[PDB]
Amino acid sequence: EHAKAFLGLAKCEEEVDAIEREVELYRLNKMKPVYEKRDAYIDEIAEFWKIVLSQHVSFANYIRASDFKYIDTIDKIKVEWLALESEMYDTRDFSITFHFHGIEGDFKEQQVTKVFQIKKDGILTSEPVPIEWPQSYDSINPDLIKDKRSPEGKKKYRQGMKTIFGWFRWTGLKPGKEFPHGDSLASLFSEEIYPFCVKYYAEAQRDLEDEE
Amino acid sequence: DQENENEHAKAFLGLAKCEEEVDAIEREVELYRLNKMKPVYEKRDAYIDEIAEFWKIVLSQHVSFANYIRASDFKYIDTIDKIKVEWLALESEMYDTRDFSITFHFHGIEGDFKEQQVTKVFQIKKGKDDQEDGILTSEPVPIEWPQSYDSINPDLIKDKRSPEGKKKYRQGMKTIFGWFRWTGLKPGKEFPHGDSLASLFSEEIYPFCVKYYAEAQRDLED
């Protein structure tokens, strides 16, 4: 028994999913103007992103220690939700653009955009995007390493692919063969870091305020 | 740096205003969701009423609900055969999007617990200064306690100041029935975590009961 009720409940849950979709699209549309206005003010604050990325708890766990030298050069982060350009896109789909100020003689100033899209629930996927790795990473650079057959050549390949730079060539299509948990890192940016960066910034001052 | 510190000040003022706009947007979005969902909840709840043991299964399925009350109370929680939540913000914009009334119907137990319908109201309140999103508060609402709970019933205990009376008193206030007189305005003197329990209902149990029920029915197979 209860079959009739169960079928009805299944249809109701479908209606709920549809509403959630409409609600999120409504929110994304309303937020676009506010984010633009907000980001313009952020661009006026020196080490904003440096401070935010160092304030986020789990972010640091996704990358290597030696990466913070370059992460600290991030001067701008902009996320754009693809669903605002067309349906066919999940509301979780987005492009994220980073601007690195660089480091004289080691890491060049550059702007890199990576696109994340849901594929079937569902999982994020992406296409590799070019990024010039720090000169300091030549020994662990996948495109450079000559002969990754030796025990050290493999160690170095693994070390480099686990850096934030390895994340840029992540696709989510070869589980176990790419930067670990690239999809979770992406979600960190679109769901936490970009939307609530100001709150992280305020918390960073608050924290350094209690130590005062 | 009179220009930069001024730029930072301008920036901070600008950001504070942006957050205010975000807060306004969040409310507008939530009102839209609640209005669209109201009709779906009514239809879904009508199907739920055709499944007699639905709520008993859902409530035993939730991961933390059980942590709020004595295992002893489940005899009575098992008689709940209807739960309906209504969001107050839909009736007036003076209500916070988190404000709601929850109505329970208990089938009862012969000679011990009367069949009855009870509605409790929860509304946000703030203390000012600190960002404080505010906390939930409520007013006591009448419910007829089980006859067997006579000795721990707050309104029947004569002493409740003596060693044994105080113990019996505290036991009763920790039951689901004690939760009905919770208000959130007398910390340490009421049903423990009455506020978190109320949120469990409006944010988890009522909205996702069907997912909990399915998960429970799924564990009966394989």
Q: In B128-182, where do the E strands start and end?
A: 135-138
- Supply the angle between the helices A194-210 and A3-42 in degrees, to the nearest 10: 60
Paired residues of B138 in beta bridges: B122
DSSP secondary structure, B168-196, as one string: HHHHHHTSHHHHTT--SSSTTSSSTTHHH
CA-CA-CA-CA torsion sign (A170, A174, A180, A183): positive
Cα A151 versus chain centre, distance: 31
Closest listed residue to residue B105, CA positions, set B86, B81, B140: B81
CB proximity list for B187: less than 8 A, separation 6 or greater: none
Q: In what order do the strands lie in the sheet with B80-87?
A: B80-87, B100-106, B116-125, B135-138
Paired residues of A110 in beta bridges: A100
Closest listed residue to residue A194, CA positions, set A63, A60, A59, A62: A59
Q: Is some CB atom of chain A closer than 8 A to the CB atom of B24?
A: no
Q: Is some CB atom of chain B closer than 8 A to the CB atom of A14?
A: no
Tally of residues, chain B: 222
Structure tokens at B145: 């306690």
Test A42 with B15 for CB contact under 8 angstroms: yes
Q: Enter the resolution in angstroms.
A: 1.9
CA-CA-CA-CA torsion sign (B195, B198, B202, B204): positive
Q: How far apart are CA A48 and CA A41, in angstroms?
A: 10
How many other C-beta atoms can be found within 10 angstroms of the C-beta atom of residue A122?
A: 10
Side-chain-side CA neighbours of B176 within 13 Å: the count stands at 22
C-beta of residue A191 within 8 angstroms of C-beta of residue A24 = no
C-beta of residue A52 within 8 angstroms of C-beta of residue A145 = no
Residue A87 exposed, middle or buried by CB count within 10 Å (0-12, 13-18, 19+): exposed
Q: How was this structure determined?
A: X-ray
Q: How far apart are CA B74 and CA B82, in angstroms?
A: 15
CA dist A27 → A186, A200, B24, B25, B33 (Å): 20, 21, 11, 7, 10
Residue A121 exposed, middle or buried by CB count within 10 Å (0-12, 13-18, 19+): exposed
Nearest to A19 among B15, B40, B43 (CB): B40
CB proximity list for A177: less than 8 A, separation 6 or greater: none
CA dist B19 → A96, A161, B30, B183 (Å): 21, 37, 16, 31
Instruction: Return the SS3 of A45.
Output: coil
Q: State the smallest CA–CA distance between residue B24 and chain A in angstroms.
A: 10
For chain B, report the end-to-end CA distance as a whole number of angstroms: 70
Q: What angle do CA A210, A212, B3 make, to 5 degrees?
A: 110
| Residue B90, Ramachandran bin (φ over 0: left; ψ between -120 and 50: alpha; else beta) | alpha
| Residue B108, Ramachandran bin (φ over 0: left; ψ between -120 and 50: alpha; else beta) | left
Test B22 with A34 for CB contact under 8 angstroms: yes
| Residue A175, Ramachandran bin (φ over 0: left; ψ between -120 and 50: alpha; else beta) | beta
Cα A71 versus chain centre, distance: 12
CA dist A141 → A63, A129, A132, A146 (Å): 15, 15, 10, 10
Minimal Cα distance from B27: which residue of A? A27
Pinpoint the alpha helices (H) of B49-145: 54-61, 74-77
Cα A163 versus chain centre, distance: 13
A12 CB neighbours in chain B (<8 A) are 40, 43-44, 47, 210
Q: What is the domain partition of chain B in residue ranges? A: 1-222
Q: How far apart are CA B16 and CA B202, in angstroms?
A: 30
Q: How far apart are CA B121 and CA B143, in angstroms?
A: 14
Nearest to A38 among B15, B37, B46 (CB): B15
Residue B133 exposed, middle or buried by CB count within 10 Å (0-12, 13-18, 19+): exposed
B48 CB neighbours in chain A (<8 A) are 5, 9
CB proximity list for A117: less than 8 A, separation 6 or greater: A82, A89, A90, A93, A124, A125, A126
Q: Is some CB atom of chain A closer than 8 A to the CB atom of B36?
A: yes
Structure tokens at A208: 């350094």
A22 CB neighbours in chain B (<8 A) are 36
Minimal Cα distance from B214: which residue of A? A6
Minimal Cα distance from A34: which residue of B? B18
Q: How far apart are CA B158 and CA A6, in angstroms?
A: 50
How many other C-beta atoms can be found within 10 angstroms of the C-beta atom of residue B139?
A: 12
Structure tokens at A52: 């935010």
Closest listed residue to residue B75, CA positions, set B142, B141, B145, B140: B145
Q: How far apart are CA B196 and CA B65, in angstroms?
A: 10
C-beta of residue A97 within 8 angstroms of C-beta of residue A111 = yes
Test A44 with B15 for CB contact under 8 angstroms: no
Closest listed residue to residue B83, CA positions, set B114, B106, B67: B106
C-beta of residue B116 within 8 angstroms of C-beta of residue B105 = yes
| Residue B182, Ramachandran bin (φ over 0: left; ψ between -120 and 50: alpha; else beta) | beta
Q: How far apart are CA A195 and CA A189, in angstroms?
A: 8
Q: How far apart are CA B115 and CA B110, in angstroms?
A: 9
